[PDB]
Design a protein around this ligand. Structure first.
Ligand SMILES: CNc1ccccc1
Length: 162
């Protein structure tokens, strides 16, 4: 198990444009295309990302390419965020994957509002952090996925993904 396998489980793989849990046009392995309610706008974003006229359909290779870029961009974003970087750096590799998972799902900004969880995670108060993390819109809207990510934060193991 690793960050790529973890997010592949949580996000799935779909080669046609679909709506994510929030109703936003998405493709591949959780690659958000747009928050716009326009399908044509999403197809435009897809063509831009892939570099060809896709007509709402991509290959597995293309999906995995976007997935690579998205994971890489999530990590690089964390490291350029003044609030997230110190907490991330303080974590072990397993919990770092849980950190990337969150940023991948809700964006950098969404996570930065977990100020109290971030502090508990840096202090390594794992049970407390796990309790605080679940007191969120994130947990309430996606409980099963959030439980897995929180368990990873709590334990520093891959038990929730086995
Ligand atoms: C709580 N998730 C998270 C995300 C990014 C860096 C540290 C922690």
């Amino acid at each position: 198990m690793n960050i790529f396998e973890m997010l592949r489980i949580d996000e799935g793989l779909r080669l046609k444009i679909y709506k994510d849990t929030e109703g936003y046009y998405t493709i591949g392995i959780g690659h958000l295309l747009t928050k716009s309610p326009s399908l044509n706008a999403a197809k435009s974003e897809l063509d831009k990302a892939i570099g060809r006229n896709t007509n709402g359909v991509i290959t597995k290779d293309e999906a995995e390419k976007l997935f690579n870029q998205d994971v890489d961009a999530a990590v690089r974003g964390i490291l350029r965020n003044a609030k997230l970087k110190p907490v991330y750096d303080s974590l072990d590799a397993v919990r770092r994957a849980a950190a990337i998972n969150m940023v991948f799902q809700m964006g950098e900004t969404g996570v930065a509002g977990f100020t109290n969880s971030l502090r508990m995670l840096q202090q390594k108060r794992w049970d407390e952090a796990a309790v605080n993390l679940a007191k969120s819109r994130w947990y309430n809207q996606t409980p099963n996925r959030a439980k897995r990510v929180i368990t990873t934060f709590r334990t520093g193991t891959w038990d929730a993904y086995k």
